From a paper:
[name] is a periplasmic flagellar protein that chaperones P-ring formation. [name] possesses a typical signal sequence at its N-terminus, recognized by the Sec-dependent pathway, suggesting that [name] functions as a P-ring assembly chaperone in the periplasm. P-ring formation is a key step enabling the bacterial flagellum to pass through the outer membrane. [name] can be divided into three domains, denominated as D1 (residues 1–74), D2 (residues 75–142), and D3 (residues 143–198).
To gain insight into the regulatory mechanism of P-ring assembly by [name], two different atomic structures of [name] from S. enterica, the open and closed forms were solved. Atomic models were built from amino acid residues Q1 through L198 (numbering corresponds to the mature protein) for the open and closed forms and refined at resolutions of 1.95 Å and 2.3 Å, respectively. The conformation of [name] is different in the two forms. In the closed form, D3 is closer to D1 and forms a compact structure. By studying the 3D structures of [name], we identified a pair of residues, R113 and S190, which are within a suitable distance for cross-linking with a disulfide bond that keeps the structure of [name] in the closed conformation. To understand how the conformational difference between the open and closed forms of [name] is related to its function, a disulfide bond was engineered by replacing these residues with cysteines (R113C and S190C, respectively). The disulfide bond forces [name] to stay in the closed form and constrains the movement of domain D3. These results indicate that the closed form of [name] can bind to FlgI, but cannot proceed with subsequent steps, thereby inhibiting FlgI from forming the P-ring. The closed form of [name] is reminiscent of the PapD structure, an immunoglobulin-like periplasmic chaperone for P pilus biogenesis.
Residue numbers in the entry: 1 to 198
């Protein structure tokens, strides 16, 4: 049962800020588990946060692939009052509701800061989870603008300047041409700054 406890803790920590209740269950055979007592878990795979995922369990040069099931409960953005097509999304129209993140439809908005100055693409009814496929977010960053790039690491932080190379909404990927001429890539935050996680 200790392996589930490790995964539950590893995922709870990874899902900090998103979920307040995480439960993880191993699907692959425990015989295929690596020799170490505490394997190092790495998500060197696609960007899927929860559900049924593949976790790399490293055991000092010994590599293993574990199939796991991640259940997550937290906040997401839901429609609170009917929104007309072309209608703006506001705090009076949408609200945060608590539910199972793993059960939500794809590309569901979790943070209210994402839908600043956003318009509906279709008719929306109360209770419906806000999906990115059903809205048009305003650009937080515009191509050609100078932006601040903030890179954080373990005991290591970098602040630098560049020019945005593409239009991007809050929480979307932004490519930035640094003064040195180099291209970097990060996530647009609410403040319009570019965050790079190293």
């Amino acid at each position: 049962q200790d392996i589930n406890a490790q995964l539950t803790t590893w995922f709870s920590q990874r899902l900090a800020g998103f979920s307040d209740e995480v439960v993880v269950t191993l699907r692959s055979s425990p015989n295929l588990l690596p020799s170490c007592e505490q394997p190092a878990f790495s998500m060197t795979g696609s960007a899927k946060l929860w559900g049924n995922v593949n976790v790399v369990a490293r055991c000092a040069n010994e590599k293993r692939y574990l199939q796991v099931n991640v259940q997550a409960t937290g906040n997401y953005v839901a429609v609170a009052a009917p929104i007309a097509r072309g209608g703006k999304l506001t705090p009076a129209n949408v609200t945060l509701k608590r539910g199972r993140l793993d059960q939500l439809p794809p590309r569901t908005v979790l943070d209210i800061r994402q839908i600043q100055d956003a318009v509906s693409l279709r008719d929306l009814a109360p209770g419906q989870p806000v999906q990115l496929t059903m809205i048009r977010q305003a650009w937080r960053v515009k191509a050609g603008q100078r932006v601040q790039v903030i890179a954080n690491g373990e005991g290591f932080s970098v602040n630098a300047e560049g020019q945005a190379m593409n239009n991007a909404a809050v929480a979307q990927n932004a490519r930035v041409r640094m003064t040195s001429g180099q291209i970097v890539s990060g996530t647009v935050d609410s403040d319009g700054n570019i965050l790079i996680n190293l």
